């Protein structure tokens, strides 16, 4: 008979436990349409940092129609992935079972370190017997039989892809063992999927071959961790009055007399953050090329200044974006340096917002350390001019 308000938190994200993995993993793939061409559905990226952009909006009826807006964006570095294997799945009354794996003839050191805790001091025998066997005629026959089994019984075909940390030449991402994920091949018949996958073997796949610029994607990633947290932060319950004996930041009543136990719907202290999330409908604002190929990464048709996607001073705690990258509108779960998965969208992409063609007019590259007011180092140089240390440097130059 009391005053009413909704409960705190979403019981569908239970338990608030630490995620089993640090990598974002797709728990489902888009519905497979056999009418389309065979195509990959996912890609692993690394979060570098955030900035903001200006664009004009194409949305008739809106008060911002034909008007500039500024959008925060997230930059995710996407070095190409390497396809090392093919797996097939057959459907049974108890769910999908993998038929087998067709391994590539050659694997990178980075892929093989994933099988070790201490690679440098190990014997480094991973895949050696497999190489010596598959190379022969009995091995060729076994591979042919596995491929024929894929053709005969598989309804689902996925590729085994791994990341290239040597190409992701990042100093703070300490890991050197490649990240491995199964990427599902959608489109076409099963034979067509197998042909695409077999062509992909031992090859590099670039993020622009999986995703196009103005499309949207879903992001699988794990959120930033906070360790043990109380109910106020973890659940959003109210703080108690100042007058409260023995503590304020808690739930006053954790239950009625009956049931004579505590329900699972009551907010408790515990792990907060480090949870897996799937975060659909992130618009791709840009798929950039690596700076060693195209250094004018942040240049647009309206801002002719030559600049890269890296802000002055670098991304804080991350460094330089050296590879291909993806500009996503808004935010994604997880901190910088964390590997994440971009998945082709599962929700229907027919709204005006999701179909809108994105054209960037300005990309902010000012310092992310302390109220950056210069877009480029040349702008700062022309503000300040000759400083004392530059004069000393020239004085040394003349002698």
């Amino acid at each position: 008979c009391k005053f009413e308000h909704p409960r705190h938190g979403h019981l569908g994200f239970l338990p608030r436990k630490r995620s089993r993995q640090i990598r974002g993993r797709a728990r489902a793939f888009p519905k497979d349409d056999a009418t389309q061409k065979p195509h990959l559905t996912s890609f692993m990226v690394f979060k570098a940092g955030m900035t903001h952009i200006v664009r004009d909006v194409d949305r008739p009826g809106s008060k911002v129609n034909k008007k500039e807006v500024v959008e925060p964006v997230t930059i995710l570095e996407a070095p190409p992935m390497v396809i090392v294997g093919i797996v097939g799945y057959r459907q049974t009354p108890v769910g999908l079972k993998t038929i087998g794996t067709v391994w590539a003839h050659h694997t990178s050191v980075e892929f093989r370190r994933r099988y070790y805790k201490n690679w440098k001091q190990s014997a480094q025998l991973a895949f050696s017997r497999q190489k010596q066997f598959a190379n022969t005629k009995e091995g060729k026959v076994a591979e042919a039989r596995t491929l024929n089994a894929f053709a005969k019984k598989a309804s689902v075909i996925r590729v085994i892809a791994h990341t290239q940390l040597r190409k992701l030449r990042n100093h703070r991402v300490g890991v050197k063992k490649a990240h491995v994920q199964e990427i599902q091949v959608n489109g076409g018949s099963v034979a067509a999927k197998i042909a695409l996958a077999k062509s992909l073997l031992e090859k590099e796949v670039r993020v622009d071959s999986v995703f196009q610029q103005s499309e949207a994607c879903d992001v699988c990633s794990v959120t930033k961790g906070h360790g043990t947290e109380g109910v106020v932060k973890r659940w959003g319950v109210a703080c108690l009055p100042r007058k409260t004996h023995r503590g304020l930041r808690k739930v006053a009543c954790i239950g009625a007399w009956h049931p004579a136990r505590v329900m699972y719907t009551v907010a408790r202290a515990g792990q907060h953050g480090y949870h897996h999330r799937t975060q659909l409908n992130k618009k791709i604002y840009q798929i950039g090329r690596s700076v060693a190929v195209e250094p004018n990464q942040a240049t647009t048709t309206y801002d002719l200044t030559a600049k890269t996607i890296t802000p002055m001073g670098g991304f804080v705690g991350y460094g330089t974006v050296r590879n291909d990258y993806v500009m996503l509108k808004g935010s994604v779960s997880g901190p910088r340096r964390r590997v994440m998965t971009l998945r082709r969208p599962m929700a229907p992409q027919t709204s005006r917002q999701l179909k809108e063609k994105i054209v960037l007019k300005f990309i902010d590259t000012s310092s992310k350390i302390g109220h950056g007011r210069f877009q480029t180092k040349k702008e700062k140089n022309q503000w300040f001019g000759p400083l004392k240390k530059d004069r000393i440097r020239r004085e040394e130059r003349l002698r």
Binding site: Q91, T92, P93, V94, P259, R261, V262, M263, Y264
Partner: protein
């Protein structure tokens, strides 16, 4: 999946490939409760039973009556912690296993042994297809148990409407199984016919007094 010790010991012993005495029951068009009772009593008697085609069990009444029964059962759940609550299984073979379990002393070791002697399948999986002639339970068959004017439900349809998601998989697999089995049966028709004609001519080749003996006991 046997341990390496089990395989090594079997290799040492020189014993052959063994299979326990197992009865395979085709539950298509069987009354759910009556088949469950018969199977439970036989399990307490030590029998090893595999039941196939649990998706084609029957319950008396319209499908909606029995789906509503299932939904009533589904809402039973431990409110303070639904994990550890009643676990509601949607698959038809799971439903049959639960029905049999409720007809056993499941909280004794003897009842547990009996329940672990039962294997339930939807359709007829390939590991069962060739193990021998399957059996029926005459006192639990629909065509003698239900007056045919009454509506009845097929267990798989109810299950798929209450959450079972493998109906189409089992349907396609059963179609493939029947097609393969019918091809294998149309072939070997010549072998069966050869054996029939062989017995017919053996009659004209055996000694006559034996033929008369067969005649008086109804075999010739």
């Amino acid at each position: 999946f046997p341990s390496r010790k089990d395989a090594f010991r079997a290799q040492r012993k020189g014993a052959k490939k063994h299979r326990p005495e197992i009865i395979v029951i085709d539950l298509k068009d069987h009354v759910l409760g009556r088949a469950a009772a018969v199977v439970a009593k036989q399990l307490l008697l030590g029998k090893k039973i595999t039941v196939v085609r649990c998706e084609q069990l029957n319950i008396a009444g319209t499908e909606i009556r029995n789906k509503i029964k299932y939904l009533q059962y589904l809402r039973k759940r431990k409110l303070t912690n639904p994990t550890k609550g009643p676990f509601h299984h949607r698959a038809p073979s799971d439903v049959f296993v639960r029905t049999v379990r409720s007809m056993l002393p499941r909280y004794t070791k003897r009842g547990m042994k009996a329940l672990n002697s039962l294997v339930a399948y939807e359709g007829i999986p390939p590991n069962v297809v060739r193990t021998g002639g399957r059996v029926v339970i005459p006192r639990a068959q629909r065509h003698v148990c239900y007056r045919s004017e009454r509506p009845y439900t097929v267990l798989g349809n109810m299950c798929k409407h209450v959450g079972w998601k493998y109906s189409d998989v089992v349907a396609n697999l059963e179609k493939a199984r029947v097609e393969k089995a019918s091809r294998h049966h149309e072939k070997q028709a010549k072998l069966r016919d050869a054996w029939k004609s062989a017995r017919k001519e053996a009659l004209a080749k055996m000694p006559k007094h034996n033929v008369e003996v067969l005649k008086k006991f109804g075999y010739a």
